């Protein structure tokens, strides 16, 4: 296989949202303190959420012929399909 | 907020190793919006 595939999975595997901002964003709604689990937990669901968009976004990108980097038009035309498919809130 | 980690996250999913900053912004919103919704939905139970 290639170093890019290797380097793309390594970036995948280790990428994650900063605990700091997930805690700050969550507590700006709850109005209260939240466990680290709630923060850790919330980060997987958020990562997964991102994953699903990019894939849709990528699939859009290519059927429209075009190529990455994904454009804002790819991001939004992807969000719609995932709602029509009922897969994201 | 996440423009740099979400950037290495867009790569691990198939985007360019250098996603368009423009798009990384739209994505951060979708996420900030997402977390919130979940946050409201979760408390509700």
Coordinates of C-alpha atoms in Angstrom, one line a residue:
Chain A
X1 CA 0.0 0.0 0.0
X2 CA 1.2 3.6 0.0
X3 CA 2.5 6.0 2.5
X4 CA -0.4 8.3 1.9
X5 CA -2.9 5.6 2.8
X6 CA -0.8 4.9 5.9
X7 CA -0.6 8.6 6.7
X8 CA -4.3 9.1 6.1
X9 CA -5.3 6.3 8.5
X10 CA -2.8 7.6 11.1
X11 CA -4.4 11.1 10.8
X12 CA -7.8 9.4 11.0
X13 CA -7.1 7.2 14.0
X14 CA -5.6 10.1 16.1
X15 CA -7.8 13.1 15.1
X16 CA -10.1 14.2 17.8
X17 CA -11.7 17.4 19.1
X18 CA -10.0 19.3 21.9
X19 CA -11.6 18.3 25.3
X20 CA -11.3 21.9 26.3
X21 CA -13.8 23.3 23.7
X22 CA -16.3 20.4 23.9
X23 CA -16.6 21.0 27.6
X24 CA -17.0 24.8 27.1
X25 CA -19.7 24.3 24.4
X26 CA -21.6 21.7 26.3
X27 CA -21.7 23.6 29.6
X28 CA -22.9 26.7 27.6
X29 CA -26.3 24.9 27.4
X30 CA -26.5 22.6 30.4
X31 CA -25.6 25.6 32.6
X32 CA -23.8 23.1 34.7
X33 CA -20.7 20.9 35.1
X34 CA -20.3 17.8 33.0
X35 CA -18.2 14.7 33.5
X36 CA -15.2 13.9 31.3
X37 CA -17.1 10.9 30.0
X38 CA -19.8 13.2 28.7
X39 CA -17.0 15.2 27.0
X40 CA -15.2 12.1 25.7
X41 CA -18.5 10.4 24.7
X42 CA -19.7 13.6 23.0
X43 CA -16.4 13.6 20.9
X44 CA -16.9 10.3 19.3
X45 CA -20.5 11.1 18.3
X46 CA -19.1 14.4 16.9
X47 CA -16.3 12.7 15.1
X48 CA -18.7 10.1 13.7
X49 CA -21.0 13.0 12.7
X50 CA -18.1 14.6 10.8
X51 CA -17.2 11.3 9.2
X52 CA -20.6 10.9 7.7
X53 CA -20.7 14.4 6.2
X54 CA -17.3 14.2 4.5
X55 CA -18.2 10.8 3.0
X56 CA -21.5 12.2 1.7
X57 CA -19.6 15.4 0.7
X58 CA -17.0 13.3 -1.2
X59 CA -19.7 11.2 -2.9
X60 CA -21.4 14.5 -4.0
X61 CA -18.1 16.0 -5.1
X62 CA -17.4 13.1 -7.5
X63 CA -20.9 12.6 -9.0
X64 CA -20.8 16.3 -9.8
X65 CA -17.6 15.2 -11.6
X66 CA -15.4 17.6 -9.6
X67 CA -12.5 16.8 -7.2
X68 CA -11.4 17.6 -3.6
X69 CA -10.7 19.7 -1.7
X70 CA -14.4 19.6 -0.8
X71 CA -16.0 23.0 -1.5
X72 CA -18.6 24.7 0.6
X73 CA -21.1 23.7 -2.0
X74 CA -20.1 20.1 -1.3
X75 CA -20.6 20.5 2.4
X76 CA -24.1 21.9 2.1
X77 CA -25.4 19.8 -0.8
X78 CA -24.3 16.9 1.4
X79 CA -26.0 18.0 4.6
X80 CA -29.3 18.1 2.7
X81 CA -29.1 14.5 1.4
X82 CA -28.3 13.2 4.9
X83 CA -31.4 14.9 6.1
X84 CA -33.5 13.6 3.2
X85 CA -32.0 10.1 3.9
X86 CA -32.8 10.9 7.5
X87 CA -29.4 10.1 9.0
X88 CA -28.5 13.3 10.8
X89 CA -30.7 15.3 13.2
Chain B
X1 CA -12.6 26.4 17.9
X2 CA -11.7 23.3 15.9
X3 CA -10.4 24.6 12.6
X4 CA -7.1 22.8 13.1
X5 CA -8.1 19.4 14.6
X6 CA -11.3 19.3 12.5
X7 CA -8.9 19.9 9.6
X8 CA -6.8 16.8 10.3
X9 CA -10.2 15.0 10.7
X10 CA -11.4 16.0 7.3
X11 CA -8.2 14.4 5.9
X12 CA -8.7 11.1 7.7
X13 CA -12.1 10.8 6.0
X14 CA -11.1 11.4 2.4
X15 CA -10.6 15.2 2.0
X16 CA -7.5 16.9 0.8
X17 CA -4.6 16.9 3.3
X18 CA -5.2 20.6 3.0
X19 CA -9.0 21.2 3.1
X20 CA -10.3 24.6 2.0
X21 CA -10.5 26.8 5.0
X22 CA -13.8 28.0 3.7
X23 CA -15.3 24.5 4.0
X24 CA -13.7 23.8 7.4
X25 CA -15.8 26.7 8.7
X26 CA -19.1 25.4 7.5
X27 CA -18.1 22.1 9.1
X28 CA -17.4 23.6 12.5
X29 CA -20.8 25.1 12.5
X30 CA -22.5 21.9 11.6
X31 CA -20.7 20.4 14.6
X32 CA -21.4 23.2 17.0
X33 CA -25.0 23.0 15.9
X34 CA -24.9 19.2 16.2
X35 CA -23.5 19.0 19.7
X36 CA -26.1 21.6 20.9
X37 CA -29.0 19.6 19.5
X38 CA -27.7 16.4 21.1
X39 CA -27.2 18.5 24.3
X40 CA -30.8 19.6 24.3
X41 CA -32.1 16.1 23.3
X42 CA -30.0 14.4 26.0
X43 CA -31.2 16.7 28.9
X44 CA -34.8 16.1 27.8
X45 CA -34.5 12.5 29.0

